[PDB]
Symmetry: D3
Subunit: 266 residues, 6 copies
């Protein structure tokens, strides 16, 4: 597991964007063999999307042959509603890059049959074989996407009933009212994420210091889902300074030395 200790969210976004670009460029994707990317929404990936767009505009990457799959979406929310994950993705990324509409995959929060929607999403992924790089964030309690703590490591895409924690946490985008925020969400499972070839988690802010600690220093246990990434063949955590508060000084010094050659240009 690699830990990239950086100072700011801005640097995290730049390091992550650069990692995605090098991965694509080394892959040399084509129409027949596209590079599949897993993506999240929310504030965490914001600086990464900004950095990706600039690199694209600088002529460094092309998403012409990149297929994307998003982690989740709100159930029963018009795609057009500004706060849907559909709107977030277009406004923040797709509107500025050369990706074909056929290459974009998003869970239909308004599918007539929800279970068929989730089932097909998984089949869609298997169609391409596997996700090459899945980027995501982490909850304060170490959970992934909308999967609850103690969730099975083999869980798959499904509908989940949101927690009041999340509702209020998300209420601000909805004026600031809690009953406006949806009650259900569609989310990829921990199994879906682990099947990815490479997993890169963005950790920003001191509220995620405990989750970072459980992932890097703690032991493998299902209550802090993030820690199971220790068993993943290729996982990377990229973090800012405030999120390192709970790590031992020596842990932080170790990773800084180990990755010293990999953290400049940011």
């Amino acid at each position: 597991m690699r830990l990239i200790p950086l100072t700011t969210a801005e640097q995290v976004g730049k390091w992550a964007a650069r990692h995605i670009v090098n991965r694509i460029n080394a892959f040399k994707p084509t129409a027949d063999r596209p590079f599949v990317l897993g993506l999240p929404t929310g504030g965490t990936p914001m600086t990464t999307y900004k950095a990706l767009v600039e690199m694209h505009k600088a002529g460094q990457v092309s998403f012409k042959h990149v297929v994307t799959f998003n982690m989740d979406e709100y159930v029963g929310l018009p795609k057009e509603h500004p706060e849907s994950y559909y709107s977030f993705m277009h406004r923040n990324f797709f509107d500025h890059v050369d990706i074909p509409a056929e290459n974009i995959n998003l869970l239909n929060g308004n599918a007539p049959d929800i279970d068929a929607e989730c089932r097909q999403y998984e089949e869609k992924i298997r169609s391409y074989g596997k996700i090459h790089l899945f980027m995501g964030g982490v909850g304060n309690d170490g959970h992934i996407a909308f999967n609850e703590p103690a969730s099975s490591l083999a869980s798959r895409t499904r509908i989940k009933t949101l927690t009041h924690d999340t509702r209020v946490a998300n209420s601000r985008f909805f004026d600031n009212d809690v009953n406006q925020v949806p009650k259900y969400a569609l989310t990829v499972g921990v199994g879906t994420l682990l099947d990815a070839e490479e997993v890169m988690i963005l950790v920003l802010g001191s509220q995620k210091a405990l989750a970072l600690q459980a992932a890097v220093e703690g032991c493998v246990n299902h209550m802090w889902t993030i820690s199971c990434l220790q068993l993943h063949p290729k996982a990377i955590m990229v973090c800012d300074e405030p999120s390192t508060m709970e790590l031992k000084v020596k842990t932080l010094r170790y990773f800084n030395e180990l990755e010293a050659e990999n953290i400049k240009g940011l």
Copy 2:
């Protein structure tokens, strides 16, 4: 991993029996595609066997197309001896249901060649492909069946030398004398159990509070075998109130909320 927090052994048995029945009924087993069930003996499963028999008698399930495999048996003990696992199973379950003798699998504690007995037991399982649901109990130190702590997660059916702890623990059924209780037992391995599609552990009594804690809150480690179930795709722990003594109040409150919709009828 799911934890079903209940109050009494009676409720545990009812919840478990109902889970087994729904699993069978949804499976729709036939002579060509039977539902394979793994089962334990002892006091722990007593209320579950009672509840299963009543549901069968109420016309809710039929074991006509269910194949069973038991976890263990005493070595060198006449099947006919009341305290053999053979007698326990018939007296407590088989004598009251419609299962064919051909569908019952029990380790022959009196096999001429013990190693061939264990080897064939494993082959027998693979014949059907896999066990769909393996129900079991847990030792006070977190061990499974007769497998010792620190046992390999890939261990298979084999003969084991019983521990004085177990001998005296089991001496009561044998008048109350320790040299009456057998010295060897045949037991499925931790690998056999983990290969099951779904694993459901019954946890009853405060003497199992430490094992419950290691399984739910603790980290993955081979000394408390039960904790390795955290890596299982589909594991369920069903417990009574006394067994929750070592859990944090919030842990118990979390699972109660999460499974609140799944614990009534008991």
Copy 3:
């Protein structure tokens, strides 16, 4: 996971040598189906190599059909240099046994193309299918071979930049000067080692007491690589008395009882 608690390095070497011999002899290797052995260098395996040579000389084993693969080698060091791992292996083992030169595999610290060297080493292993028994030692921080802590469980053979800890640790063989000891080493990965059918780790000395504790009593976590052996189907730790300092009295008493029948002749 088995733990063989012994008193001296001499006994450890004898127990280990005997285990390797019984494994080979039971395997009955031939030219078409050789027994593949993974091996380490350094002081740790010294008593094992001595014991192996004596058994061979006593006519108990033949390495005619044994293929060996070593864990590592110094980069840019003449095979002929006494301190190379090549010289260590010949001087300490190969010079005294009947193994064909074609059956010996060692990483070429002087390969023209280092990455091709590592890649081919892995292909070479897969050629034979798998390593039947990989013997190794453990670092004070629980690391394996030259793999760093937090290394992926799927890491493969590659070049690694040595740590000053190791340089000075190894400086004595090089007069006692640190700039004489190489800067790079080729090493098998944690994945290479875990793919072995059986893994046997030799733990000698009190400086390894913390690593022994993390492996036996601790929980599974990527910082102490050695602990991941808890998930291995067939792992064995063989240790001397000084290395048990951090274990609980009951842990040591447990394994002594469990392996009591397996520790005499030493």
Copy 4:
């Protein structure tokens, strides 16, 4: 150390008020031998002050011979300013009871010489000999009054520079602006509090669950000041349900049994 596990803040206040009243009434204070009470401000003691006032109005206690000492006060804030601790105490307690102005002791946030103010406050206490019962609350990190974590157990009344945590935490009373809230506060020390004959801490809310755990289950350590109360001859913690989230089920069950006879009338 006693722990009184209750459900609501309302019950906590009633239990605490009743404890203070019984203590006074059993003491039988006079003008020459008054009962000295230590008191806090803030939301935590609100239900206790309400309950005390009702008991007084019901004719159950008289504060005619009770001397009070408050834990802290804002520096450079007009006594008259509604948010001063002076105003809080009068508005919430003194305005409704029969206590003489001569019996009220509050730190003068506007003393000409601050160090003389603190010194005299301590002398004032020693004048009466000792505080018979000091009631207080606890910070989320286990700190007492305005004393920082790792503060000496012998610290005395002094001026402290408030922490931004506290400023914003307290900003709401000041419109909701942070630069309105004072920068300095006068506070009794941990030594002052420990010298009291009996110490009763009110713990309300889940944000104090970690502090409650450190005090009841944790070990004695200066980082969680509250835990040092384990060495106090007579300490009592009174808590509501949300604050028990981090305790073990058995801990909560133990204290409920032990104090079962002492928690009804609330």
Copy 5:
């Protein structure tokens, strides 16, 4: 804190008896300046009483000028009843030594006024000034005498309501029935014990392994009363082999080395 690691209960009793004798003999007690000894009842001190009696009979000590105070006694039980602590002490110790009846102090389980009984017991102790050596045992949960866990370190002699754990634990002496064993007991407090000049705790049996660990290796905390002895100026723990099961090998090796010169004659 000293830990005397021995093998058998017999050796523990001999070491303890010898320690008490040397303490008395070095003290040179007289009628005006007697040596005050605190003592316990139960199986734990049995081998010590046996050894003391033999030394006395061998002419090595005289209890002519030794005043004793016992830790507890059953409430409402005839002194004459064989199972009273009064009968235990006479039958097991006093009947065989030269101690004056005036020098024996035992709590009167049948005092007309229980609170006066406890109060006077404390005054009696203070009369002599202090207890020079208080010997006692330890509960499985680390508690002292009949004091509950979390009891104040300043608690004094008082009446306590026995716990069903203790009742059944003690039921055997009363035929084997639980409702025969008293409901109340008089016990010295943790404060009474800590005021002693020297405290010596006898730890026998594996059921006390956790208490031994909490006292020697654990941190100071009020839940395991025994651990507070770490703050005592002169405390000694004397133990047999089974009680060391939870200590680290190095801890046991340390104390064995440190006290090696002090453990022979046993």
Copy 6:
């Protein structure tokens, strides 16, 4: 407890020297009321002695009315032998300051009667009343001076048998041979040190990182003597950067903020 986080040994020495000087100067010692200072030997205090001498030479302090007491001395070693603590103190401090010979107190490693020597040393201290400031270092296992781990918090000056760890640790000053270094040493006790009004521990080097952690973050326990300083009214730890390796990033950030105003001039 204060923790002063600095970078170098040089800064530690400067901060410490300045603290001692301000303490003396504020005290205004006279012949009738001298300032009593406790002092250690070894490499740890070297930079502090250097800084003290410079301040004295700069005319900032005078030791004319300062009485000193050293922590220890080697038994049976000529005062004149360069490696005695007597020679260390004169060569490194006394030879450069204005302290009267009558004001220097050192344990006589060659006293005719060792026990009388220790007894008188304690009486000598009590003569002056108390030590105002005792400076010392800390062992890798948290021990103080030559007091062993688990030593009583009330231990007093006495003779101690040195540990091979210490012998070899100290062998370098004696050519590099271990049998040259003395077998016994006289040392002040943990009680002697705790009676001081203020205690300041110098922590230098990564080998003391575990001891620093036990003292700052750990809980109070007698195995790491240094941790008992948490109960001291006025203790200060001054450390360099390498010694902070085991602390949490937030702990180090906390103390840096808290003492930010107190660490410049160094």
